[PDB]
Design a protein around this ligand. Structure first.
Ligand SMILES: [Ca+2]
Ligand SMILES: [Ca+2]
Length: 886
């Protein structure tokens, strides 16, 4: 085909010869594993993944399947989600601690709020192994070598000339046909000779593994030692025209292909995992999995390469091509095009041209969308983990050979994985996250009982929404590991659930979809019930006059075990906000919205049995929300991180806060979640926004110099800065992520490789060009909720450009063209007919007018007390409105 217009990451040498000189990080002491993370090119179908090395002779595709997880039922005889009954005492331990805080304690020792001690029960995500395609060349001398990742077509390509013959390789993983394809060619008949093997990683425990050949198919199968999970992979080799010979390798164990010209390999893998509490198994036998995997490769071969490839590209491109961004970038087809590793190095050196700078920025942005398609499909069994689905490291136990188990880290990281999912028009890719959080409900009720005394009768059978609450913490797995971890500071964080419910609720916010409303309403209802009934209390003297969440830590500074904090109260505020919105949208069938009549923190008074002593008092969602008072501006003009805080880093009396990083540059900004991702601190509130900008500047600058960071920290700061409207600072953060936190394969790093920052980048660029989360209040006091904000934080660096296919809440598809730093055209497609309300930050919307083609729309200009303006107008589903300067 014509690929000149496609987006490529491309390299002029194999992975083995690609620069892997950036910081390796923990677990990457093996030069070979470090080389994997910095140089290989990922692809996937949401379920299986490969990372292509592009080696000339011993070619290698590191292989993953999303469900290959140790831990869980079968890892012990008593697996119970890590919950420690002796520590939790059915809520008694937490209750006693909160009473101390209520009676005036500033801090308590939260040391016994722990669990999850058994690393075998926790487990971790495993690298499955490798596909090795050994051409058995005498040397690796080549010319005209290239390897690429075609982001537009979802496939990896390798080409080179060796001893008069041109060898090509193409790799993709089809979602529609559930199968990995390797298309391999030589330019001369009989010159394609290779050995096919697929060894499982040797660093995890396996029982009864066998490798059998039954040309045309190689099968590896066994069960995991740690938990008995059955696994099965197969490679079917189809000689393209039955030309060439298929034999068995001398080792076992491999398939040899001789004297061929071209072949297609069909690769499949599965386990008997099911996301289903409490057994987490399909109930299949090994033979039954073997048969299932066999049907995948056979079906694909019956379809054939042309049809499978066509179906793959149609499917991949349908999602990939929804968004287009032009900031003036060069690309792989440009005259004087630069390979992607050389591009990164030029960007780091300061010698990249404007076009090349825009190419790197724009490629990293696109890669975040690409990586979502590869790791998180609407039919994936699990959401993307700390590494999407791609890993090379393996070991049996949690906190072992793989950094943080490549797990589901739900106190910023899993959240970040789903920051760009809706705004960058990949909404259905959020489905496995929604299903994952749904999946936490049953096991989470066990935790909620043990640690907070919220008992759901028969947690297994009680529908989501009808139980007493579900609790989960930071480290999560495939197996309902909802217990807190073994040390409080990093292990305990029940507001992780509220937080991930933002990602979930946004699936409804951006779509208006009725079936999603029911699902998000059920999750929000039970979690809001949980907080109102079991987690909120009237604060003691240290935290002023308010309900707080009680025993808390602000990751990861200050005192352990304070009386609530801004981080948690901001999250609980948002959750109640969204639960109320969801209930209103349903006609508040359960009568839970209530009001603020006779509403007081005293209404939460409990006896020693945990029962309310004023049982019939108002504890409705509206009342509880109103009592949080999450944002308090402190004596330094900052957002307080603690309710006992005065000036920054100090208590009200001027003494210093212990555990506060006194240089003011603590890496986390847990108290700013109301600015991003939430709706608590917005451009529409200058008091709060000015204070949030003050907090951000203290955290992010040393002197007047903006500081670099990596991984999730830089991703969070880009998005947080975007919400302020400071496009220039936001952009300088983007530059700093590209310079200091991207490997040659554009994997984001911490170090080591962590995918969160890849997805965070894509989201941050979205939030520069379009915001949709805030609420505008006009001079008449009318609210415009989730108004469309065009170019809210456009950097001066991007003087002109266009973007199309972004999504705004209310379900509008948005395109924008700008020149000389100001919008020239907005194209707003109303997908659901919701009333439009449009701010034009780069232009002033009062200077614009609205048309439906030739029809002039009678848009009204409304303005707020601060003198900013919205264009408001009714819309019809399916219609595009063009907004242009008068
Ligand atoms: Ca997945
Ligand atoms: Ca919202």
């Amino acid at each position: 085909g014509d690929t000149s217009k496609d987006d490529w990451l491309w390299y002029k040498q194999p992975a083995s010869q690609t620069d892997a000189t950036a910081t390796a990080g923990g677990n990457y002491g093996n030069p070979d594993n470090n080389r994997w993370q910095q140089t290989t090119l990922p692809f996937g179908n949401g379920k299986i993944g490969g990372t292509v090395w592009g080696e000339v002779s011993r070619e290698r595709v590191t292989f993953n399947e999303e469900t290959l997880w140790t831990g869980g039922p079968g890892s012990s005889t008593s697996y119970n989600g890590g919950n420690n009954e002796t520590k939790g005492q059915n809520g008694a331990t937490l209750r006693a601690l909160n009473k101390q805080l209520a009676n005036g304690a500033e801090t308590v020792n939260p040391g016994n709020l722990t669990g999850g001690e058994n690393a075998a029960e926790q487990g971790n995500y495993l690298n499955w192994g490798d596909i090795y395609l050994d051409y058995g060349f005498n040397d690796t001398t080549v010319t005209e070598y290239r390897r690429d990742l075609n982001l537009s077509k979802g496939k990896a390509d390798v080409t080179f000339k060796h001893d008069g013959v041109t060898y090509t390789r193409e790799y993709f993983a089809s979602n529609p046909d559930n199968v990995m394809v390797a298309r391999l060619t030589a330019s001369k008949a009989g010159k394609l000779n290779f050995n096919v093997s697929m060894p499982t990683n040797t660093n995890y425990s396996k029982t009864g593994e066998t490798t059998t050949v039954k040309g045309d198919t190689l099968t590896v199968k066994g069960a995991l030692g740690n938990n008995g999970l059955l696994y099965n992979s197969q490679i079917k080799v189809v000689l393209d025209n039955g030309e060439g010979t298929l034999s068995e390798g001398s080792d076992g164990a491999s398939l040899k292909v001789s004297d061929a010209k071209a072949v297609t390999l069909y690769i499949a893998a599965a386990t008997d995992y099911k996301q289903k509490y409490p057994s987490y198994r399909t109930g299949e036998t090994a033979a039954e999995v073997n048969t299932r995997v066999a049907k995948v490769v056979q079906d694909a071969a019956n379809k054939g390469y042309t049809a499978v490839k066509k179906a793959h590209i149609d499917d991949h491109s349908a999602i990939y091509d929804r968004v287009k961004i032009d900031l003036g970038q060069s690309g792989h087809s440009s005259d004087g095009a630069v390979a992607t590793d050389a591009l990164l190095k030029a960007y780091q050196r300061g010698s990249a041209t404007t076009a090349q700078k825009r190419e790197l920025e724009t490629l990293v942005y696109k890669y975040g969308r690409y990586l979502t398609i590869g790791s998180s499909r609407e039919n994936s069994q699990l959401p993307s983990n700390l590494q999407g689905i791609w890993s090379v490291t393996a070991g049996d136990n949690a906190h072992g050979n793989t950094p943080w188990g490549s797990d589901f880290h739900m106190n910023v990281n899993l959240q970040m994985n789903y920051w760009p999912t809706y705004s960058a028009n990949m909404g259905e890719l959020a489905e496995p996250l929604i299903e994952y959080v749904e999946g936490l409900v049953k096991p989470g009720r066990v935790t909620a009982k043990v640690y907070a005394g919220a008992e759901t009768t028969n947690p297994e059978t009680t529908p989501i929404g009808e139980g007493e609450g579900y609790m989960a913490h930071t480290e999560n797995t495939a197996y309902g590991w909802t217990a807190p971890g073994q040390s409080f500071s990093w292990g305990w964080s029940p507001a992780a659930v509220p937080w991930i419910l933002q990602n979930v609720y946004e699936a409804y916010e951006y779509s208006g979809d009725p079936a999603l409303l029911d699902r998000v309403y059920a999750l929000l209802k039970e979690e809001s019930h949980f907080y109102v009934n079991y987690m909120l209390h009237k604060a003691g003297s240290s935290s002023g006059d308010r309900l707080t969440t009680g025993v808390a830590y602000s990751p990861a500074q200050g005192p352990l075990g304070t009386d609530g904090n801004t981080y948690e109260s901001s999250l609980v505020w948002q959750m109640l906000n969204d639960a109320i919105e969801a209930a209103k949208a349903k006609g508040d069938p359960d009568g839970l919205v209530g009001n603020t009549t006779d509403c007081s923190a005293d209404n939460w008074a409990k006896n020693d049995s945990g029962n309310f002593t004023d049982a019939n008092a108002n504890r409705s969602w509206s009342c509880a929300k109103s009592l949080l008072k999450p944002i308090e501006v402190g004596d330094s003009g900052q957002i307080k991180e603690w309710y006992f805080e005065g000036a920054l880093g100090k208590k009200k009396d001027g003494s210093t806060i212990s555990g506060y990083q006194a240089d003011n540059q603590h890496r986390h900004m847990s108290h700013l979640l109301g600015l991003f991702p939430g709706d608590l601190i917005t451009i529409d509130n200058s008091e709060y926004m000015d204070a949030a900008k003050t907090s951000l500047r203290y955290r992010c600058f040393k002197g007047n110099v903006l500081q670099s960071n990596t991984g999730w920290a830089i991703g969070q700061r880009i998005n947080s800065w975007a919400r302020t409207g400071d496009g220039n600072t936001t952009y300088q953060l983007v530059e700093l992520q590209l310079k200091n936190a991207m490997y040659a394969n554009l994997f984001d790093y911490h170090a080591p490789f962590q995918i969160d920052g890849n997805f965070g980048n894509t989201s941050g660029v979205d939030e520069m060009l379009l915001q949709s989360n805030s609420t505008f209040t006009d001079t008449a006091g009318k609210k415009y909720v989730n108004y469309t904000n065009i170019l809210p934080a456009l950097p001066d660096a991007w003087a002109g450009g266009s973007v199309s296919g972004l999504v705004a809440r209310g379900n509008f598809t948005v395109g924008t063209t700008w020149k000389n730093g100001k919008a020239t055209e907005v194209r707003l497609t109303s997908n659901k007919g919701k009333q439009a309300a449009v701010k034009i930050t780069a232009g002033g919307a009062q200077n614009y007018e609205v048309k439906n083609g030739d029809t002039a729309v009678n848009a009204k200009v409304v303005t707020n007390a601060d003198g900013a303006s919205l264009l408001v107008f009714d819309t019809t589903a399916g219609t595009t409105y063009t907004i242009t300067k008068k």
